[PDB]
């Protein structure tokens, strides 16, 4: 199946899922100077103070921290989505190492690793529909470098030895995600897709211009969870990033001057 190995990784994905070679795929290098300011793009308005999370599970390729999506609870809106979208899960990409990680890029430059909040639009009534639709999900996006440690990140960073391998899930109740967001919520955006298969055009992308720090022993941690199940020759989860895509015909905006 699908992964990130040589022989399964994303120089392969288009043979079993052919719309990796489309118009809109995602991540891009985002050209920060050719970004155009868009004065009409509203303010984000991310309401998470309702959140609730359920469980953490590590799926294969990351590891997903899930939502109770079944009520408008934890919301995105504004900037340049049109209606409500709610939160469904957050996860990561990292690197092997700190120099890479990312799967935007700014300038060329990777990050050690980028958080994903994925939302989706409550007029498709479930995220399976939702995914199917163009302006299906709103994903934020947040860079990490690593410097100091993000105290809303340890929680996350403690339980992973609970779901070291491919299909462990645990509870993971009352996390606050507010806890992952850097202080300015000025963003790029653009449309674009799922980084990972099927990998859908069905996503405006909003990622944030500023980078929240982590620890080395942060992201170290994140280093030590397994591709493989439980009972399987362990293969390190790193370098779970797919690497930037032709823009084409997009144009990326900024809603910072
Ligand atoms: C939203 C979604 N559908 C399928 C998967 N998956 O297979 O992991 N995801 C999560 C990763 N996709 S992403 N990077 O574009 O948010
Ligand atoms: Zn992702």
Redesign the pocket.
């Known amino acids: 199946h699908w992964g990130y190995g040589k022989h399964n990784g994303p120089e392969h994905w288009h043979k079993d899922f052919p719309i990796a070679k489309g118009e809109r795929q ?2 891009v290098d985002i050209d920060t100077h050719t970004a155009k300011y868009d004065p009409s793009l509203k303010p984000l308005s991310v309401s998470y103070d309702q959140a609730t999370s359920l469980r953490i599970l590590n ?1 294969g ?2 590891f ?1 921290v899930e939502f109770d999506d079944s009520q408008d609870k934890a919301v995105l809106k504004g900037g340049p989505l049109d209606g409500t979208y709610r939160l ?2 957050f ?1 990561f ?1 990292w690197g092997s190492l700190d120099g890479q990680g990312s ?1 935007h890029t700014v300038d060329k430059k990777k990050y050690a690793a980028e958080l ?1 909040l ?1 939302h989706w639009n409550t007029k498709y009534g479930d ?1 399976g529909k939702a ?1 199917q639709q163009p302006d299906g ?1 709103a ?1 934020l996006g947040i860079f990490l470098k690593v410097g100091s440690a993000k105290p809303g990140l340890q929680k996350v960073v403690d339980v992973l030895d609970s779901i070291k391998t491919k299909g462990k899930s645990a509870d993971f109740t009352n996390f606050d995600p507010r806890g992952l967001l850097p202080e300015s919520l000025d963003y790029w955006t653009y449309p674009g ?8 055009e069905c ?1 405006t992308w909003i990622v944030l211009k500023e980078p929240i720090s982590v620890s080395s022993e942060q992201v170290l941690k994140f280093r030590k969870l397994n591709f493989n199940g439980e009972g399987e020759p362990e293969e390190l989860m790193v370098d779970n990033w ?1 690497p930037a895509q032709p823009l084409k015909n997009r144009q990326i905006k900024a809603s910072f001057k």
Do not use: D, K, Y
């Open positions: 995602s991540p799926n390729h990351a997903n469904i899960q996860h990409h799967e994903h994925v995220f995914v999900l994903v897709s799922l980084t990972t298969p099927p990998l859908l996503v797919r």
